[PDB]
Scaffold this active site. Structure first.
Site, PDB file in Angstrom:
ATOM      1  N   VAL A 181     -86.445  63.104 -84.795  1.00 50.71           N
ATOM      2  CA  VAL A 181     -87.371  62.203 -85.526  1.00 50.71           C
ATOM      3  C   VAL A 181     -88.826  62.391 -85.055  1.00 50.71           C
ATOM      4  O   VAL A 181     -89.757  62.195 -85.833  1.00 50.71           O
ATOM      5  CB  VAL A 181     -86.967  60.696 -85.457  1.00 50.71           C
ATOM      6  CG1 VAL A 181     -86.619  60.113 -86.831  1.00 50.71           C
ATOM      7  CG2 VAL A 181     -85.774  60.387 -84.543  1.00 50.71           C
ATOM      8  N   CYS A 182     -89.037  62.762 -83.785  1.00 51.11           N
ATOM      9  CA  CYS A 182     -90.370  63.040 -83.245  1.00 51.11           C
ATOM     10  C   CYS A 182     -91.075  64.156 -84.009  1.00 51.11           C
ATOM     11  O   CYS A 182     -92.307  64.175 -84.058  1.00 51.11           O
ATOM     12  CB  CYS A 182     -90.309  63.571 -81.813  1.00 51.11           C
ATOM     13  SG  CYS A 182     -88.941  62.910 -80.876  1.00 51.11           S
ATOM     14  N   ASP A 183     -90.291  65.110 -84.522  1.00 53.57           N
ATOM     15  CA  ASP A 183     -90.786  66.242 -85.280  1.00 53.57           C
ATOM     16  C   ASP A 183     -91.598  65.732 -86.432  1.00 53.57           C
ATOM     17  O   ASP A 183     -92.770  66.090 -86.547  1.00 53.57           O
ATOM     18  CB  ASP A 183     -89.660  67.140 -85.800  1.00 53.57           C
ATOM     19  CG  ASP A 183     -90.248  68.163 -86.775  1.00 53.57           C
ATOM     20  OD1 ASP A 183     -90.827  69.161 -86.300  1.00 53.57           O
ATOM     21  OD2 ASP A 183     -90.183  67.917 -88.001  1.00 53.57           O
ATOM     22  N   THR A 232     -85.941  64.237 -79.832  1.00 51.90           N
ATOM     23  CA  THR A 232     -85.047  63.423 -80.671  1.00 51.90           C
ATOM     24  C   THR A 232     -84.926  63.881 -82.148  1.00 51.90           C
ATOM     25  O   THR A 232     -84.311  63.166 -82.944  1.00 51.90           O
ATOM     26  CB  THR A 232     -85.403  61.918 -80.586  1.00 51.90           C
ATOM     27  OG1 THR A 232     -86.457  61.604 -81.451  1.00 51.90           O
ATOM     28  CG2 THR A 232     -85.918  61.341 -79.257  1.00 51.90           C
TER      29      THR A 232
END
Length: 167
Positions: A59-61, A57
């Site tokens: 944002v998971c990063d 997604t």
């Protein structure tokens, strides 16, 4: 109850909100390598757990990867990430980023984790974005449930909890 929103209205959770001082429920997820791993293994160190819905997604990063660096800066911590997503998608995201301090895991299967920690969103069948920290006893040292599934926790928070105990 953690009662998370999904960008416009509330969404129900299976399970209960867990807290600091409580014994963590103790379950199993798959590793990204297709083996069972459980909280009983994770207690071998002070461990952070980073729940995300799926790994692709973007944002998971801001979690898994920043956690890799912060865990290297701590020098002595253990960290995992958990998704409702494919073990190989998770392995790959790690391989692309060159992650080493964190390992990704798949609750995808039996939801035992997402259910027990109260982060399976019943109305979506999707993992919440939440984080936890666990003492070597398997006690919750910190827990947080982002009130909004479309937003993510700050990794500094469980870092500050874990870094207090690894000293």
């Amino acid at each position: 109850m953690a009662e998370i929103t999904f960008k416009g209205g509330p969404v129900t959770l299976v399970g209960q909100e867990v807290k600091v001082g409580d014994q963590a429920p103790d379950f199993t997820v798959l590793t990204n390598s297709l083996e069972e791993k459980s909280l009983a293994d994770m207690k071998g160190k002070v461990t952070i757990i980073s729940v995300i819905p799926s790994i692709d997604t973007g944002v998971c990063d801001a979690q898994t990867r920043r956690f890799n660096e912060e865990a290297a800066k701590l020098g002595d911590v253990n960290v995992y990430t958990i998704s409702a997503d494919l073990p190989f998608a998770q392995a790959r995201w790690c391989g692309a980023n060159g992650i080493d301090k964190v390992e990704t895991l798949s609750d995808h299967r039996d939801m035992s984790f997402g259910e027990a920690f109260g982060v399976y969103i019943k109305e979506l069948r999707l993992l919440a974005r939440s984080v936890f920290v666990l003492d070597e006893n398997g006690k919750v040292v910190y827990a947080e449930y982002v009130s909004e599934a479309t937003n993510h926790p700050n990794y500094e928070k469980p870092i500050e909890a874990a870094k207090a105990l690894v000293k």
